[PDB]
């Protein structure tokens, strides 16, 4: 919120990951690294010294406390471990602080390589089968002049069929240029910096007017490969790798299960991996003994590949089960994968999840909580009521009420239940009207209570139906839903111009059958009347068909069933009168007068189902 | 009529099959071993094996919650081909659990069952195989029960090419690899082979190829081609057996299509017959062969514990097989014993995968009698061997006329797993190459009767007869009236009439699965509607109080003595007391014995009164927290007959199958209160006690050992109400038979939590309040809100007889409790045949429309549904049963009209109403103008509802997914971890779920705030949600958004995975980078 | 609707009939027996595999 | 025998995608340029299943195929730019040009629109079909201003005549609007394709980094994004959301 702004994003670089991770302290000193692998000590309970969950250089463990001891309270703000590294806090600082394996060798990233677009191959104009074997270096490439004497640049060959190449040096010093052939993976490091991006690209450029077909299509990227890259100026060498970064510790975290069964993690385990191919290595270094042991574990040393992604390019390492180890790589990367459902699609908490059964009974605008899930719901603003008027008193202790089950609450609970909007969701979400708000009832049960009107929207029928009580929970978030979510803020589906909203079929059918007719029942003949409430009088008198169409006053214009304004049995005669059956409806005129009689002609039951109408949308 | 002989023991014997054969058959096989020198051999003695009397039993077993088995135990042979050392003596190989009396293997703690499974049978086929343009291709293929796989094809061009393990190298040294004799091919193919003689581009060189090419040409690249190089290469395919078979079977079909002689008891592979390949492909090629069928059990087959229990034996011991060769030959082995040299324990563990963990198991579901039917029986290709689940993906699921008669189309999960789970034919049985059984009763050319033979066939295929379907109008002994009747030839039904065909129905139903059967009448009911419905039985519930349906399609009786909660006499007798807790040929003393000994036998010990002991179960936690406790049915001194069920459990009362009760059912929209989908019942459910679960399931509890400082349970501490402390017991334990109702307290957890870096106020406070006490703490057992239950039992121990405890751990606290609990609202209950019901409200026995005799009614309905849904003939029931209830009317009779073949249905009902209604004596539970229909005099005030509508009996039957255990929401609590977000996994504190799919409809009206929040200050922000928690009860203006952090530690991952981001303000000094870490 | 017959109320109507591939009708006559050529011959023309 | 490739349980949820991204409905590419009549049954004469198309103004017909399974059938009343010769909307980007190319007596936007709405509006009308074909609704709010965004981006090529590039698939409105400044401060306005996408080739390339990994792509998506500085900003609805800035769409998106 206003301190962030708008995140940009590069390539990486060591040096300038050498600007984080380390944190020089007042011993003076400078404490970034991490060397050699590791969890806790089995039987004390907390990490050493390097250490994969160091509680020195990392901080913390029992928050504010001194790995080297004699450090107990808090308020320090500064502590130092005199005597060790620890630097405390809260322990919260920990999550805080990165490290880095520091590669000896300057391995390369993954996420160019293999890449689906390759970028590192690209540029340098190395085929990624070509740099493919630089790694993996199963064939060095002639690096950089290095080929005075003949041989050729760009090139490539494996040892064995270099050895035989420089041999000569026996004697032979046709090695006036004295540069080695390419060596391994490193060379292509070699050539990402050193090499003039400027001078080349324009170089392209003029290229361009040249025929531009199928090779054009690199061209034309090299241009952008370059120009993407000419936006910074950066190195290109941050693709291969000098040193790692590596996540804090107590988000990989280990875990406890009592037993002996402590999961642990699985990222950890590729340091574990690859801290030590990297030590160990250099470890060999030193004794310098054969490359057999040494070149051959550079491999084994970007090899780190599989920590970044256990899956691209190598076989996968295997897993408690020859699992793809979920690469560091591989937390964010599915639906299923943290990133979007762990922000975009949190689980999150206060709301109910209770089955659907039919409860048809409440109204639409609001719907029905049960108490199963009545308290929860709103305890927030329920404890805080129930003291807040003094009933009683703090926490734990005032809500004594609740689990003491008396009624106060249940009551009180209500009285701060009506007027408090609450929205729910179908266990699909479907669409915007699919999560509608509606007012809360204070009912008991474990399943829902709602209004069938809309079922359709949510369309949650009632068969085993399962959905969830959300609710609000700013204030004004009450007003997403007080006038602007809330069942009564639709008529229709913001789909398409039509009210879907209606009484079910079942409803419908009570319409219908109200407006159809049995032979049978076709009594009343000349049971007219003023068409008020007489008629159904006239039907809690029964003696009539609920569809016995008697003709019934209303000037007021009346849908007839058929045409009503047309000459059908005329009897216009004099001192008025001009009197035409008109099917359903039947005045007579009157020259100096006007029409009266009107006469609507159809059922008492037809202007009943025709009367709660008005009324009912608003009278 | 005919008896349809126990599903249930395929497996049995074929499991029982195994060991009465395979223990050896393997092993012998493989029997002879020795130091790598060859000197000193010990064997597996192959013969005259050995096992002793595991005292364990299934409850004993289920006793210590451990796993059932038999201590398993072989001799070797001797020694050496040295000096011919003996030092035979038996040697303990693999002690392991095994079916059980319920069809489980009782292993640890439970009792799961094994699914079986399809697949690809052997063999060696090939597709037909087509293209971009049309023109075609021919291409071959191998596969033994177990292997690689031997592939063929055509380059458009009488080609071939061999790919095997490689999917590398358009490779084809046919013949130039093995069997390299001068022009063999014309001698083995002869027909065209390669246009008669061969192509271009192929040669056919072999002296350095046989052995030696395309095994290292292009293959396995780099050393030199040694020509043993590619030659004990290619034993290392094949010849070696232990690493291929066919599987003898494999031979059995695979020279039996391929047909050619190879009977030769060889489960490993020649020559020859691949030529037979390759020409039959190329014989297929020029159109002379047919395709192979590549779907069904054409290529598909089950398997079963058997040879699962059998394929990892041989492995498992194949690992062994290694270890020991150099265990045996690790240094000295003059004394050195078998009995030294045998680490049984890879065996027994492995195995103990195979039941315990090989994905196989489930945890035989036991929610109703018939579910362990089904799931006796269901099976999948789900397998180690299987497919994927989504990359098997259509004829797979499909159907396939085989299907008919062998399997049911009525099961079908509806998942993303679903069309994999072979119903099982009602009647299949299988063969030695599990090939399972569908009859194909012969009818000579028009007469039936079933007194010809076969009846019994059609294993897995057929017969090129065309051939008669189940029913038809059979007549009087048999002459098969239709004129001109259709029946199948293969996978199609021509038709024709007393000639051709011969068989036909053994019975008008082989192809259902245990539930599938239930539908009374389903020859009234759609196939598309017949399914879930179906399945809502295969897993009904139980209750407390059993009753046999009513009416009557009684298939099943029998089938529920399958299951086993009934019990059939072992044996024999009638009954002397008969006593609830102890019926008895047992030690009765008396006639139970008798019979108990009717024409006696011995090792059943007929030696004295007879003496059938065996204890009846009460109600016990089902692997489902399921329960059901029998009864003791049989009164005393009744004759019986051996093994006719005399037990009543759970759902019979007597050999059949307790599903629902039976209830008058008007349809009727009235006042709504249901109007899909929506039951309404009335208030006398709960006042008729029935409709009443009971359920008990775990809880326990255990305490650490801390090596933080070892901690107990308690007998108290503080705040303890003895109020809580009472029903307590003498450790802080729980007395059972003890009433317990919502945050009740098991029993008494004594923690660890030391205060060193006492909490800032915290010395003090202690110290100033004005007590001293201390942090020994308490997270003693508090059982769930809302159980009230009384307590019902409990297994309990500690260190002492060896607490057989999961280590790290002191002692077991497990314990539990039920309810007697009674149907509520949104209790899926519904009936057998396209069904699913929940319930609004329940109500006035009064109000509720009642009867012109005078009754009221017990079940609306709605009425749209069934015409809706498309089930019919649910009235049917209603009505049929209405009899039966009018003049106590049983039926038991198969589904499908087939009596004269049409509308007889009808004619029954109008029947055994009429003469019911007829002597019913009121004669107006019938109107002959209401054929069918009843008045409806019962508005809200007993009006006369108008049109006579139609009610009579159903069989409501409820389900499981009670509110109780599906209800659910929460305010908050533990986050995660990792997001240290709170986390649904359905429990207590579930996560409200949440659905982003919603965030993608939130935004439609945007607004922020409820998303600020809503998102925030229920997932990241601590300080946000915590901040929250006051605002409230702090009278504040709830704020403002956090700003997630959830956030930041994906954007940390990234950083760390190559990010940077100088997110910042930018109003500042040239913006900057604000610290947003 | 689409055309129908008459042996008495016709041939398919619905499913809506206001787009036809090349594969084969099947000959395995219908009556077991020497099938021949009586009325007919098989030309060969060759016109889809430029064989037969 | 020719049997059914037809339908009637046909043009459903798969009927539509096919498209939605625009891929290639039945593959065609008939030609345009304006005869169009009858023309014998294949172009000129026929013959024992020769195979031509149509012709009358002009100089020339345009000639490919006709098979049994697949027809024109219009005789004359042939109309380019539009009215697919043989009859078939197919990859549209080459009727799209088939369009504007003949809609090149118009400068390129006006009447390319009137390719443009045409195929757009076409579209809409074309998803509209199975939806009342299947008895349901669409809106143009629902389908047009979808089907609208799904082109916005031209195909440059030349696009150095604006010291830019060739085969630059930017959009148009925009970028030309300062091909407009290139047609207003000299030099040259460029000249390009306006050409349909498909939603994953205008998405996942509009979005980027923060707009990006999360939907059709990820891993090297986004993180690519920093091989080029490119920022992002937490304008998407969306891009806020990953955050929990309050988004636009919100009073305060416009009452600040």
Redesign the interface.
């Known amino acids: 919120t206003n301190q962030f702004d708008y995140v940009k994003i590069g390539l990486a670089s060591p040096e300038r990951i050498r600007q984080w991770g380390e944190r020089t302290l007042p011993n003076g000193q400078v404490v970034g690294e991490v060397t050699k692998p590791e969890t806790i000590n089995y039987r004390t309970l907390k990490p050493e010294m390097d250490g994969l969950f160091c509680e020195r250089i990392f901080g913390p463990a029992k928050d504010w406390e001194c790995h080297c001891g004699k450090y107990k309270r808090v308020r320090h703000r500064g502590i130092v471990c005199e005597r060790c590294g620890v630097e405390v806090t809260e322990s919260r600082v920990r999550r805080h602080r990165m490290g880095y394996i520091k590669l000896a060798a300057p391995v390369a990233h993954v996420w160019y390589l293999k890449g689906i677009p390759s970028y590192i191959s690209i540029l340098l104009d190395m085929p990624l089968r070509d740099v493919e074997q630089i790694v993996y270096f199963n064939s060095y490439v002639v690096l950089s002049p290095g080929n005075a004497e003949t041989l050729t640049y760009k090139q490539l060959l494996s040892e064995d069929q270099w050895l035989e190449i420089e041999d000569q040096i026996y004697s032979e010093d046709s090695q006036l240029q004295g540069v080695e052939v390419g060596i391994g993976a490193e060379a292509l490091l070699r050539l990402l910096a050193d090499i003039n991006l400027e001078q080349e690209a324009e170089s392209l450029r003029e290229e361009i007017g040249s025929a531009k077909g199928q090779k054009r299509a690199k061209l034309i990227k090299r241009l952008r490969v370059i120009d993407n890259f000419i936006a910074t100026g950066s190195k290109p060498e941050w693709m291969v790798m000098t040193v790692i970064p590596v996540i804090p510790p107590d988000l990989r975290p280990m875990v406890q299960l009592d037993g002996g069964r402590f999961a642990t993690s699985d990222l950890n385990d590729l340091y574990r991996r690859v801290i030590n191919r990297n030590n160990r290595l250099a470890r060999l270094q030193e004794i310098l003994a054969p490359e057999i042991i040494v070149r051959n574990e550079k491999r084994m040393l970007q090899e780190v590949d599989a920590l970044i992604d256990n899956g691209r390019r190598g076989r996968t390492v295997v897993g408690a089960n020859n699992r793809p180890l979920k690469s560091l790589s591989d937390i964010i990367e599915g639906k299923q994968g943290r990133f979007r459902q762990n922000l975009l699609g949190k689980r999150v908490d206060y709301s109910g999840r209770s089955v659907i059964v039919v409860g048809p009974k409440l109204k639409i605008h609001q719907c029905g909580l049960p108490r199963e899930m009545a308290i929860e719901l709103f305890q927030p603003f329920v404890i805080n009521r129930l003291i807040r008027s003094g009933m009683v008193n703090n926490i734990k202790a005032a809500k004594k009420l609740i689990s003491r089950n008396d009624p106060s609450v249940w009551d009180v609970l209500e009285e701060v239940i009506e007027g408090h909007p609450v929205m729910l969701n179908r266990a699909p979400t479907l669409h915007r009207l699919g999560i509608q708000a509606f007012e809360p009832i204070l009912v008991e049960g474990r399943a829902i209570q709602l209004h069938p009107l809309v079922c359709p929207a949510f369309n949650a029928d009632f068969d085993g139906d399962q959905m969830a009580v959300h609710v609000p929970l700013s204030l004004e978030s009450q007003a997403e839903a007080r006038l602007l979510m809330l069942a009564s803020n639709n008529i229709l589906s913001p789909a398409t111009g039509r009210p879907i909203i209606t009484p079910s079929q079942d409803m419908v059918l009570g319409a219908y059958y109200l407006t159809a007719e049995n032979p049978g029942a076709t009594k009343g003949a000349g049971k007219y009347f003023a068409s008020l409430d007489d008629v159904i009088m006239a039907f809690q008198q029964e003696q009539i068909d609920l569809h016995a169409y008697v003709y019934v006053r209303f000037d007021g214009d009346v849908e007839s069933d058929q045409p009503d304004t047309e000459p059908v049995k005329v009897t216009t005669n004099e001192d008025g009168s001009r009197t035409v059956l008109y099917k359903y409806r039947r005045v007579r005129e009157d020259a100096q007068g006007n029409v009266i009689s009107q006469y609507i002609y159809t059922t008492p039951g037809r202007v009943i189902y025709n009367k709660a109408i008005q009324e009912a949308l608003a009278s | 009529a005919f008896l349809l002989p126990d599903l249930i023991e395929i497996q049995r014997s074929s499991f029982r099959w195994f060991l009465e054969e395979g223990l050896i058959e393997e092993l012998n096989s493989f029997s002879p071993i020795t130091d790598y020198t060859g000197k000193l051999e010990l064997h597996f003695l192959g013969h005259n094996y050995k096992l002793k009397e595991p005292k364990y039993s299934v409850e004993e077993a289920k006793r210590r919650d451990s796993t059932y088995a038999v201590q398993m135990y072989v001799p070797t042979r001797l020694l050496n081909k040295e000096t011919g050392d003996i030092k035979e003596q038996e040697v303990f190989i693999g002690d392991l659990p095994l079916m059980t009396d319920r069809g489980t293997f009782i292993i640890n703690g439970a009792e799961r069952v094994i699914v079986n499974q399809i697949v690809r049978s052997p063999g060696v086929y090939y597709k037909s195989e087509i293209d971009k343009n049309?023109?075609r291709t021919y291409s071959a293929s191998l596969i033994p029960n177990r292997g690689a796989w031997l592939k063929f094809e055509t380059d458009r061009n009488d080609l071939v090419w061999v790919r095997i393990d490689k999917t590398r190298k358009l490779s084809a040294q046919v013949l130039l690899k093995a069997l390299g004799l001068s022009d063999n091919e014309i001698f083995d193919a002869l027909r065209h082979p390669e246009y008669f003689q061969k192509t271009i581009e192929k040669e056919g060189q072999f002296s350095e190829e046989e052995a030696l090419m395309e095994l290292y040409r292009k293959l396995r690249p780099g050393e030199p081609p040694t020509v043993l190089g590619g030659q004990q290469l290619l034993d290392s395919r094949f010849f070696d057996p232990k690493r291929y078979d066919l599987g003898r079977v494999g031979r059995y079909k695979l020279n039996k299509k391929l047909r050619l002689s190879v009977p030769d008891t060889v489960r490993v592979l020649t020559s020859g017959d691949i030529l037979a390949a390759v020409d039959y492909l190329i014989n297929l090629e020029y159109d002379i062969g047919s395709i192979d069928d590549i779907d069904h059990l054409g290529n598909r087959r089950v398997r079963s514990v058997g040879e699962l229990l059998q394929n990892q034996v041989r492995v498992g011991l194949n690992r062994l097989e290694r270890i020991i060769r150099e265990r045996m030959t690790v240094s000295d082995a003059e004394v050195l014993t078998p009995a030294s040299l045998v680490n049984p324990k890879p065996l027994v563990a492995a195995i103990k995968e195979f039941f315990g963990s090989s994905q196989l198991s489930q945890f035989m579901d036991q929610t109703n009698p018939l579910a362990e039917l089904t799931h006796k029986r269901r099976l999948s290709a789900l397998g180690p061997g299987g497919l994927t689940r989504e990359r098997a993906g259509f004829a797979v699921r499909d159907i396939h006329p085989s299907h008919y008669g062998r399997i049911c189309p009525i099961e079908t999960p509806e998942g993303p797993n679903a069309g994999l789970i072979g119903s099982l034919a009602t009647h299949a049985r299988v063969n030695q190459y599990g090939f399972l059984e569908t009859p194909f009763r012969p009818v000579e050319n028009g007469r039936v009767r079933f007194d010809q033979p076969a009846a019994y066939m059609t294993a897995d295929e057929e017969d090129d007869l065309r051939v008669a379907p189940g029913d038809i109008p059979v007549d009087e002994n048999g002459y098969i009236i239709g004129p001109q009747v259709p029946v199948r030839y293969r996978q199609e039904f021509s038709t024709t009439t007393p000639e051709q065909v011969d068989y036909v129905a053994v019975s008008p139903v082989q192809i259902v699965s245990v539930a599938t059967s239930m539908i009374p009448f389903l020859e009234h009911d759609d196939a598309n509607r017949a399914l879930m419905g179906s399945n809502m039985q295969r897993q009904a519930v139980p209750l407390l109080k059993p009753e046999r349906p009513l009416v009557g399609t009684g298939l099943e009786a029998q089938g529920a003595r399958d299951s086993g909660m009934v019990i059939v006499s072992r044996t024999d007798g009638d009954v002397v007391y008969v006593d609830a807790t102890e019926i008895r040929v047992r030690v009765s003393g008396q006639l139970p014995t008798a019979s108990g000994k009717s024409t006696d036998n011995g090792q059943l010990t007929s030696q004295k009164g007879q003496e059938i002991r065996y204890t009846v179960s009460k109600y016990q936690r089902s692997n489902q927290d399921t329960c059901l406790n029998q009864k003791p049915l049989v009164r005393i001194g009744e004759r019986v007959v051996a093994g006719q069920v005399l037990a009543d459990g759970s759902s019979t009362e007597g050999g059949e199958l307790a599903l629902g009760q039976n209830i008058v059912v008007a349809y009727m929209?009235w006042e709504?209160?249901?109007?899909?989908?929506?039951?309404l019942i009335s208030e006398r459910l709960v006042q008729d006690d029935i409709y009443t679960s009971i359920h008990i399931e775990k809880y326990e509890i255990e305490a650490?050992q801390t090596?933080l400082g070892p901690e107990e349970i308690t007998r108290e501490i503080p705040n303890v109400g003895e109020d809580a402390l009472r029903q307590l017991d003498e450790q802080g334990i729980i007395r059972i038979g003890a009433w317990v109702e919502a945050?009740d307290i098991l029993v008494g957890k004594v923690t660890p939590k030391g205060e060193?870096?006492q909490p800032?106020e915290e010395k003090l406070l202690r110290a100033i309040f004005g007590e001293k006490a201390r942090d020994v703490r308490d997270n003693s057992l508090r059982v769930p809100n809302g159980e009230k239950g009384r307590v019902v039992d409990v297994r309990l121990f500690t260190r002492e007889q060896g607490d057989e405890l999961?280590?790290?751990?002191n002692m077991v606290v497990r314990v539990y409790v039920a309810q007697k609990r009674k149907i509520?609202?949104?209790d899926?209950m519904?009936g057998r045949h396209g069904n699913?019901?929940?319930?609004?409200?329940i109500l006035p026995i009064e109000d509720m429309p009642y009867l012109p005799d005078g009754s009221p009614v017990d079940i609306v309905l709605?009425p749209?549904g069934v015409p809706s849904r498309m089930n019919v003939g649910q009235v049917f029931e209603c009505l049929l049963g209405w009899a039966g209830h009018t003049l106590g009317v049983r039926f038991k009779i198969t589904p499908f009209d087939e009596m004269y073949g049409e509308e007889s249905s009808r004619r029954i009902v109008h029947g055994k109403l009429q003469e019911a209604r007829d002597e019913t004596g009121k004669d107006w539970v019938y109107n002959p103008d209401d054929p069918g229909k009843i008045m409806v005099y019962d508005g809200r005030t007993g009006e006369a509802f108008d049109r006579p509508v139609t009610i009579g009996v159903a069989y409501m039957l409820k389900?499981v997914?009670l509110?109780?255990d599906?209800?659910?929401?929460?305010?908050?609590?533990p986050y995660s971890?990792?997001?240290q977000?709170?986390?649904?996994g359905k429990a207590q504190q579930?996560?409200?779920?949440?659905?982003?799919?919603?965030?993608?409809?939130?935004?439609?009206?945007?607004?922020?705030?409820?998303?600020?929040?809503?998102?925030?200050?229920?997932?990241?922000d601590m300080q946000g949600?915590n901040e929250?928690?006051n605002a409230?009860?702090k009278?504040k203006?709830?704020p403002?958004?956090?700003?997630?952090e959830?956030?930041k530690?994906?954007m940390?991952?990234?950083?760390?995975?190559?990010?940077?981001?100088?997110?910042?303000?930018?109003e500042t000094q040239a913006?900057g980078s604000?610290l947003?870490? | 609707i689409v055309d129908g017959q008459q042996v008495k109320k016709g041939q398919l109507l619905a499913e809506v009939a206001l787009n036809t591939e090349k594969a084969v009708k099947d000959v395995a006559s219908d009556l077991a027996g020497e099938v021949k050529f009586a009325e007919v011959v098989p030309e060969q023309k060759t016109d889809r595999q430029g064989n037969t | 025998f020719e049997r059914a490739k037809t339908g009637d349980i046909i043009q459903g949820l798969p009927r539509i995608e096919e498209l939605l991204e625009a891929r290639k409905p039945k593959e065609a590419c008939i030609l345009a340029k304006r005869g169009g009549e009858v023309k014998v049954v294949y172009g000129d004469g026929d013959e024992a299943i020769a195979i031509k198309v149509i012709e009358s103004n002009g100089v020339v017909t345009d000639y490919p195929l006709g098979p049994g399974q697949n027809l024109a059938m219009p005789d004359g009343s042939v109309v380019p730019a539009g009215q697919p010769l043989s009859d078939g909307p197919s990859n549209p980007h080459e009727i799209l040009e088939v369009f504007f190319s003949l809609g090149s007596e118009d400068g390129v936007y006006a009447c390319a629109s009137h390719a443009l709405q045409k195929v757009q509006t076409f579209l809409v009308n074309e998803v509209q079909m199975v939806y009342q074909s299947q008895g349901i609704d669409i809106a143009d709010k629902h389908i047009e201003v979808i089907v609208r965004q799904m082109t916005n981006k031209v195909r440059i090529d030349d696009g150095g005549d604006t010291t830019m590039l060739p085969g630059e698939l930017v959009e148009l409105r925009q970028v030309e609007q300062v091909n407009e400044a290139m047609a207003i401060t000299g030099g040259a306005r460029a000249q390009y394709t306006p050409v349909l996408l498909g939603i994953t080739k205008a998405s996942l390339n509009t979005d980027s980094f923060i707009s990006a990994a999360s939907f059709q792509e990820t891993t090297r998506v986004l993180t690519e994004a920093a091989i080029e500085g490119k920022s992002d900003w937490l304008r998407g609805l969306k891009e806020n959301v990953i955050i929990g800035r309050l988004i636009p769409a919100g009073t305060g998106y416009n009452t600040y």
């Open positions: 049309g023109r929209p709504g209160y249901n109007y899909e989908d929506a039951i650490r090596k945050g060193s870096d800032p999961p280590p790290g751990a509520q609202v949104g899926k519904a699913k019901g929940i319930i609004s409200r709605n749209l389900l997914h509110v109780d599906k209800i659910h929401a929460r305010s908050t609590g971890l990792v997001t977000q709170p986390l649904g579930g996560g409200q779920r949440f659905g982003e799919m919603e965030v993608w409809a939130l935004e439609a009206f945007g607004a922020a705030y409820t998303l600020q929040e809503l998102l925030t200050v229920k997932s990241d949600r929250a928690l409230i009860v009278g203006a709830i403002r958004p956090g700003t997630p959830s956030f530690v994906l940390r991952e990234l950083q760390s995975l190559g990010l940077d981001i100088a997110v910042h303000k930018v913006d604000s947003d870490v």
